[PDB]
């Protein structure tokens, strides 16, 4: 019933990540060494915020 | 058959499907026939 | 007859709380006898009728007011409309040819 | 069975056991199937809300038991006799009472005819000497009664002050009575039990009011029931008339009690007073509450 | 005229206010074409929130006036409104003997 | 002022997407339309300075949920009375009484 | 079944698992065909439109919930114990819980005797001494509650601000409450989350009421839902006098959260502030949704 | 059956297959006996006449669908999730889709819950994991539907004209809908098609008006149906105020169709035209109708 | 189900409970905000 | 046997057999009795 | 119960007053000349918080 199939005007799109959290989280996925490759370091000695 | 159902109901009167909203306005109107002529122009 | 007796010397009860009963007040006129307020009686000791000593009396002086009609879950009564509305007009005028 | 009986005694004064040992020794028994029997019918109350419907309030409403007895005996003559004391044991202007038996005690019921009695089956009752009679009673008072609890103390002094225990242990608020002589002024206590009815439930914990200034001759009697007025002398004074307004506000809340305090003053002769706590129950056996 | 917007696209207030002239329009036979112009004169809001009827808010419109189609105890105050002035005006114009 | 042809162009060419992008708009109008109309009342109680002094001061407001039942009219050029029903456990109730 | 459990949590604190595992242990069990005791009832408005009848929105109404107990014993004299706790496990004007535990989760509904239960066979239920009881209770409260979860925000300065984490994870809105303490100005949000319900979905997005000062020792509760006053002072101030035609208007919509920000300024002394949020749902059991 | 396919896309976008081919897979299936389904309800009006009454027209009603579903499952959790999937695929506020399809194509209908939904048997489900759900869902537009027959006319000149070819294969009028950029006056055709609603259907045959001239990134759609304003224009501003009471009267009846004529003037860049034709039915299925 | 019964009397309308008192005192109060700000206050 | 037949139509109240024009009438008359004395003799 | 639970009555209570904000509040109840008979004074001659 279609005249044509048009792909959605899909709009403008943000994101953000501080890292703050525990562990790294399903937003990132790890890729080439699989799954688990990835961490939280806390860098306390400069006292600064977490980073991945 | 006839006595003892809907169709006693009927000699009832107005036990089953009945409003109150159509009787109103036909007593209002009723009312109005009565009254309006009699009511002064002012 | 008067029966609400607001206009006496003595006042009567124009208010009063299930706790503590009526209180009595007295009209207090201002300036030119137009406007009338209620003063209370701060030391109410008016005196019980000589009708209230009586046996068999059950009427209702105008001097001492008694009945409150209770409404509560346990009432004997059915209450069907406490209405208040406030005051109007602040003023009036009352004239034509003089 | 042994562990519930039920009695009759009429307006006249006839015993009649219903059901229980000794049951149908007078001839009638009952059958099965009595309704509004067991607990108070209460309506609840709701009022249009954000959620639906809020919580308004309880009424209790009068009982309509419906039941059915069976008069029986070996000749129609005597049978007669017995369906005639079954009638006569009833009345639509005076109350009978109805006796509920069982190991939490003894409870009763003051019930009326509410319509005529539906006797007998389609054809006489002569042929069986056995029939059915279907009545449908009324209790204006919904509530199981057992006799009340009372107390009394005297005194001689001129200004005096007692303490009656007092505790609700029934399921429903029960509204005291008092029966003070004269003269005197009494100070009676109309403690709230954390009842926020008034919207005073902490305010009025301690409340006392004082009764007016009974004149000679002037005994009271002051129920808080609200079937009844408040104050009523003995000489017929109009003692509510004098006392301005005033009047006991609060029941005794279930599983509520303390020593309420009782203050007499002004009493040259030294009077009495007597406290007459009702006990209420909304089904006919139930273990006590706390 | 009188109408009832239960969901039409009409937003009292916004689209139409009290005074101002709109067009309406009744499906019955010789006059589907024409359109009646009146002042808008009246409009209600009313909702009922109880259980058992159940009325979202909605705008009931009155456009034009009629004192013949009006109700017979409308009619009647505001007869009586006309005549207690009248006898205000003529009391205060009386003149003393 | 977004032209055809630049709309065109922004939809890379396609006039269905381009008529897709013109309908979405359309529809996001008709949408703050009906929303517009389908908002709920704020009805809020004021009341005069107990001091006695000039400006309203705010009451309270009653929810539109929290309402029984209510009715407001417009009328042109007369008086009407508007009808508030609430529970009597409402807090703006408790206060008016 | 272990798969769901229902227990019931008097008025007077006693303990009743009705079904699943340990059921029956304090003599009363649940009876099948239980009604509108799963989903909360709704009724959908409609009015007149051109094809018919246009949606026009829906009310959520109070819960009926009609079921049945059964009290048993070996003995009538325990029987007759265990169903006088079962009826004093219950009250009108007071609720009892009703809880239910399964995978997802224990959900309570507060519930209160509707109207009398009705108990008992025909017969005297000492005979059997296992009898059953139709219980007609209601929520006034439809939803299906878990605890609510409440957080804590103490400073010492006299100017800070803080992210509170919220997050409504059942299928309904929930209305937020915040107890503030004084002096001090609150800065509170009332973020929109999207809802259009006074047709400014996006205009408060990010939308945030300032309480008024708060003088010593008027600390407030400030409750978002319509069945509450928004703010009251503990002393009985008139706090919201003073407030100027303003209000929290938004429940947090299903789904939605964020770090809701909270400011405070003008504390000689700091502040706390405390938020609880409900946990509703409409089904005593559900997966999460997202 | 294989000649017909029942499916569900809830409100989260979820599948299910509820009858034909693939059935079950998502454990949910559909038990018979489902009401108001296949036809449009329609009441037909009669006034008092002579001979009895006269037919006086016609109203569709809007759809109330009562229908059972069956979830399914081995395991209890499983059924539990399933049950929980198939809760969340339904709403109050938003309708989800329910779609047919047979050797006719497929259509599709727009549902929402009534009320709420009636679950599982008299026992707990987790016993049977096999439970029934009885929905009542509702259908505010009546009509079951297809994809709508789109043109799209652009140009280049000043002042151009067109023909749309348009005809109505289904059984009950539908309305059309334009979406026309700006600037430029545009002539939009409004035939009657014949049809006697305002006693004008010859007279109207060749119907055309006028839009108002739109100004510079005023594009708008022109939507001919009852419930929704006609015209609205994309940058907000009031097209309609401008349009001097004239609308859209006319819908494509049954059975009609012709090459309708689109004018452009008074377009300096030269616009586009698109014409949306809806393809409503009344029933799931039915052959073609000329 | 329900159609045919008390589903059905719902759309019949006001034919099972429904009073009459209470539909009297609404059109009264309906009655009463129509032509109470009008009447005078002589 | 009288719960939940017309022993509690009763209690429904004016459900089944009930008609409007005797209400109406005596709505009328006791509106006729508080203000027929007020009415003024002209 | 009774061992659980803590009653209202058998609960010791303390009460506290400033008058700083220079308003009586509802918890002091006139007594013998009823409402209006109690004020707060600010007695800010001297350097003295409000009485009552």
Redesign the interface.
Known sequence: PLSTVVSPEDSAVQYKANFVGQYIGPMWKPMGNGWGSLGIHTHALISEAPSM | SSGGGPAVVNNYGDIHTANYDEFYKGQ?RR??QQ??PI??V? | VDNSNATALEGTFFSGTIVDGFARSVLLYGGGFVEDTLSVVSDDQTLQPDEYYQSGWLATMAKMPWLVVRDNEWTPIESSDLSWGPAKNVSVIV???? | TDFLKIELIGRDGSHWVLSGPGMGQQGVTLNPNLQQFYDAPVKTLYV?GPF??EYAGKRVQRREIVFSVQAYDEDPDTWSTVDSLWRWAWDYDEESELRVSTSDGTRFLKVRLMEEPKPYYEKDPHITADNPIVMTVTATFPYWQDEPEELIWTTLSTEDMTRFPVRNDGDVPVWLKWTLTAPGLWILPDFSWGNDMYSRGREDLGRTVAMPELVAGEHVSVDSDPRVQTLIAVNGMPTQNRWKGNDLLYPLMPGKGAEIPVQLKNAPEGGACKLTRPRWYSRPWSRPGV | HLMAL??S?I?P??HID??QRM?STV?S??V??I?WVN?????????????GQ?????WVLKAG?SDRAM???????????????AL?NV??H???S | ANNWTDILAASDGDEWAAFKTIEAQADEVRAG??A??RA??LIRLWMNNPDGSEGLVYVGRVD??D??????????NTPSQGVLELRDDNYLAVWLK
Do not use: C
């Open positions: 209002q009312e109005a009254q309006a009511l002064p002012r | 004239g034509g040819d003089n | 249009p639906g419907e | 239960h969901d696209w937003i207030g916004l009290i005074g067009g499906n036979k010789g589907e074409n359109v002042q808008l004169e009246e409009m209600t809001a009313a909702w009922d929130n109880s259980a159940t009325m979202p808010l909605s006036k109700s017979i105890g409308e009619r009647v105050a505001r007869l009586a409104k006309k005549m207690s002035e205000n009391g205060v009386i003149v003393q | 339309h009906q517009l109309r709920k009342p539109y949920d309402t029984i039942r209510g009715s407001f009219p417009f009328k042109n």
